[PDB]
Amino acid sequence: LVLAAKYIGAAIATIGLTGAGIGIAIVFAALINGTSRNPSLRNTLFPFAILGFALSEATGLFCLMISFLLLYG
Amino acid sequence: QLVLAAKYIGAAIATIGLTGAGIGIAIVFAALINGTSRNPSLRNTLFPFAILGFALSEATGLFCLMISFLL
Amino acid sequence: MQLVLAAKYIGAAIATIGLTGAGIGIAIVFAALINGTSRNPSLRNTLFPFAILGFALSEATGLFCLMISFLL
Amino acid sequence: KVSLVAPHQAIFTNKEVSQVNLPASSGEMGVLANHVPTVEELAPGVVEVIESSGTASKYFVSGGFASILPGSKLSISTVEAHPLDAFSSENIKSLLAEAQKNASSADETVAAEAAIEIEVLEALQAAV
Amino acid sequence: GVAFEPSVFPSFSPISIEESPKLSEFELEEDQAIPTSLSQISLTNAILNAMAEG
Amino acid sequence: SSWQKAGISFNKYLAIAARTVQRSLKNDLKVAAEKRYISDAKVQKLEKVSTTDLASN
Amino acid sequence: IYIIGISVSLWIGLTILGLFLNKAVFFSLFVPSGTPLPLVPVLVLIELLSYTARAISLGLRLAANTLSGHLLMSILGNLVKIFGLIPLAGIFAIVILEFAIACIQAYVFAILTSSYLKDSIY
């Protein structure tokens, strides 16, 4: 039976969402606390937050494609 | 049928290591964003350690993803 | 045997879960030594002796756990 | 290299020192050779400066601001800096007993000033 | 030691001491009074030095 | 202490700690030291060339 | 009450997505922070996708409050079989927290709608 083990591959693979969810808040906590020290507002800290969040979110997008491929192919 | 059933579950248990790779990319960026506001680590200097430090932490996620993708 | 060979492969994977404590332990002592040396002035002594001795104690957990998975 | 200059006399003045341990606001910090930049407030403790060997001079500072420059320079600006041998044990007990009885006995700034004088007198009497 | 001249010395406030160029180079406690304590201590020191020279 | 809630700044806190440490030391070593903690100066705020009440603590 | 809460929350989520799409027909669109990079359209998990997650989280307050009150049936059989006065203090604290959760859930729903109206006019 291959259909029974295919459903378990989409549940245990979602355990990696803890690092992607906490990583978006870790980069936002340092940017909000650093901007109040004057005066990283326009660009500088604001431009690095958009590029820094894409690196932390890359692990969640790659792990989600593995569980989604087992439920379709 | 037991060999094909274990291959589908192996792609999910091997993805548990993404918590260290996802949080590691943000831990290096949090210290670089807070340290750049102290004046004046902008161009180069701290930019080289952040680019080299992020590639070393991302090596664990790329090696762990090849194991589940080889099934 | 089929039941004896299946438990040996599962034992080598469950025993390898302890690498998170040994891997983060070597980095915890290195993070305090890098930040402590910048505050002057223990570099080649004082803090250098505790970092070498402290890393050997944290690495004992990874070496003992690796022998269990290697013998199963 | 220390610059412990008071507002009445000069102690270190010229740069001819090695190590110095002064009590700051957080903990008992100690400057070594090339110290890092740290401008923390000094509390009412003992400011000992080790002169190469064991020729340290314990100077009981009354509190100030220990400034550490980036060029391996320590500027300990304090109001009063006296040695440990210039204090009397009989006269120190009279100031601590009068400040404890006057605390929480009136109003205005009389009870608030007695609490700060009792804490500074207890720390100097325990380091004899 | 015979003649003199009228000089002047500026005194910064608490808002100008924290807005310096290299003010964040030293380890200062941002939770406690660090910006206000630097301007209050400098006012009494500058007044004592000007009165002694005068 | 809690000197931020009252009207005591860094100048008043440093003068109170230096005067209490000098009086708690040796009584015989108080030569040329009592004049640094006692003053007869007064302060009077002016307005418009009139002034108000003169205070001296 | 559980089926009516999920149906009422789904209608509020569709109105927030339809109002933001109607304002984009005459005030440009964009809605994306640019910092010399790309791949901004792949992370479209907000605006339209955020309305589905906010409606299920806000609508679950009615089902979570009913689960706390229905849990007293298991503790009633053990108290009528240490002293049983510990169950009265615990049920009073859970009832006060469930009633106060309605005010926090209503304030969280109004704060989420303020971000959609301010971003649609900027």
Side-chain angles (χ1 to χ4, degrees), chain A residues 4-5 9-11 13 16 19-21 23 25 29-30 34 39 47 49 52 54 58 60 66 73, chain B residues 5-6 10-12 14 17 20-22 24 26 30-31 35 40 48 50 53 55 59 61 67, chain C residues 6-7 11-13 15 18 21-23 25 27 31-32 36 41 49 51 54 56 60 62 68, chain D residues 6-7 10 23-24 27 30 33 37 43-45 54 56 63-64 66 70-71 81 83 86 97 99 103 106 111-112 114-115 123 126-127, chain E residues 1 3 6 10 14 21 33 35 46 50 52 54, chain F residues 6-7 15 17-18 32-33 41 55, chain G residues 5 13 18 24 32 34 36 38 41 53 55 59 63-64 69 77 84 87 89-90 93 100 102 106 110:
Chain A
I66 298 169
Chain B
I67 298 169
Chain C
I68 298 169

